[PDB]
Design an enzyme around this catalytic site. Structure first.
Site, PDB file in Angstrom:
ATOM      1  N   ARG A  86      39.117  39.182  33.652  1.00  0.00           N
ATOM      2  CA  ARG A  86      39.290  38.293  35.130  1.00  0.00           C
ATOM      3  C   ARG A  86      39.493  37.454  34.992  1.00  0.00           C
ATOM      4  O   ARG A  86      39.951  36.626  35.583  1.00  0.00           O
ATOM      5  CB  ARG A  86      38.790  39.133  36.453  1.00  0.00           C
ATOM      6  CG  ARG A  86      38.813  40.004  37.177  1.00  0.00           C
ATOM      7  CD  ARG A  86      40.139  39.726  38.464  1.00  0.00           C
ATOM      8  NE  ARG A  86      40.478  40.395  39.163  1.00  0.00           N
ATOM      9  CZ  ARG A  86      39.607  41.551  40.339  1.00  0.00           C
ATOM     10  NH1 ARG A  86      38.042  40.949  39.732  1.00  0.00           N
ATOM     11  NH2 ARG A  86      39.873  42.759  40.358  1.00  0.00           N
ATOM     12  N   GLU A 112      23.547  46.267  35.473  1.00  0.00           N
ATOM     13  CA  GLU A 112      22.237  47.136  36.852  1.00  0.00           C
ATOM     14  C   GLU A 112      21.671  48.217  36.353  1.00  0.00           C
ATOM     15  O   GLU A 112      20.499  48.177  36.279  1.00  0.00           O
ATOM     16  CB  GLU A 112      23.197  47.379  38.297  1.00  0.00           C
ATOM     17  CG  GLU A 112      22.743  48.075  38.866  1.00  0.00           C
ATOM     18  CD  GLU A 112      22.825  48.449  40.166  1.00  0.00           C
ATOM     19  OE1 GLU A 112      24.626  47.942  40.988  1.00  0.00           O
ATOM     20  OE2 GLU A 112      22.175  47.695  41.883  1.00  0.00           O
TER      21      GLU A 112
END
Ligand SMILES: Nc1ncnc2[nH]cnc12
Ligand SMILES: Nc1ncnc2[nH]cnc12
Ligand code: NA
Ligand code: NA
Lengths: 177, 177
Positions: free
Chosen positions: B60, B97
């Site tokens: 992105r 994470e």
């Protein structure tokens, strides 16, 4: 011009395995003249085409599709590996050398009447493009054009897309697998 | 203008898990006015900066970094997950994470004296950007600017980049994790 673009692309031998001459488009990306010329040639090629959307697959497709979309003044629509797009998608499978994968598109981003250009960096076997064409057409979009910086004609990508009614336009071509 | 860009971004509630309001930049991509305005504002913001290269992480980041590079007339340099770049790379690790991953850059694409702008779509925790800064600096590049379409200030990305001496510029900001 076309020669300056082609000279800006580097070749890395025996990568990713011996005998393959890797054609590395990142050297074009870092040459502002060759990069902007590439976008200029792709966009002008379709200026009279009535294109209303450009589609590009992640990630290298983004590098050429989105600037062409901006130059044409039309919306850009990403095609992504699964689980990256947040809204409703449809999906198509395609073959890798060693298994299967899928591509997704947002169902809302293509609608009947859309004239769609697909842009990618390099045409090899054409499997991702062939899946991308199916996604677009399932949503009522019209696609008859695919554009690339590089064509490797020996890998049969262009012949295969011709079978789906796709006209491929490539800036340069290279020998080899 | 800034309002038209912000209104063009959709929010998807309870994705990817309940309570999170997902800010979906793909709706901006498909709106040619909002997309070209976003690139206009990012590029003009740095027009006087002496920037010589733009770096963006896949995927992105490519959608915003490469058009800014083209608008500034400077080279674009990709930062990628491992095993995608063909020439010599260096690498930096960062935390996800649930584990660790790495980012790579071409050692030849940044050199001492380069003034480098990093561009990405959305600033969350800032871990990939922080790794990207280290890559650039290791190669003798100067980087003090990071630009984004979206900042989520509550995730601490901007504070963290400030600690590395990075000035962050974002077009819009949103509440939430
Ligand atoms: N020679 C080559 N260079 C870059 N990408 C490829 N994909 C398949 N063959 C290739
Ligand atoms: N709310 C959010 N929208 C988009 N990307 C994110 N990354 C972390 N939080 C996010
Ligand atoms: Na639709
Ligand atoms: Na270097």
């Amino acid at each position: 011009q076309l020669k300056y673009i082609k000279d800006s692309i580097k070749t890395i031998p025996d990568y990713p395995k011996a005998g393959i001459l890797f054609r590395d488009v990142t050297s074009l990306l870092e040459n502002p003249k060759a990069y902007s010329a590439s976008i200029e040639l792709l966009s002008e090629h379709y200026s009279e085409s009535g294109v209303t959307k450009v589609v590009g697959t992640e990630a290298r497709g983004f590098l050429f599709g989105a600037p062409v979309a901006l130059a044409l003044g039309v919306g850009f629509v990403p095609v992504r590996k699964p689980g990256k797009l947040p809204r409703e998608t449809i999906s198509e499978s395609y073959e890798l050398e060693y298994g299967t994968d899928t591509l997704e598109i947002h169902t809302d981003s293509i609608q009947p009447g859309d004239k769609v250009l697909v842009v990618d960096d390099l045409l090899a076997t054409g499997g991702t493009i062939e899946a991308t064409v199916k996604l677009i057409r399932r949503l009522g979009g019209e696609v008859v054009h695919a554009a690339f910086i590089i064509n490797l004609p020996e890998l049969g990508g262009e012949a295969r897309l011709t079978q789906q009614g796709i006209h491929c336009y490539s800036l340069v071509s290279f020998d080899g697998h």
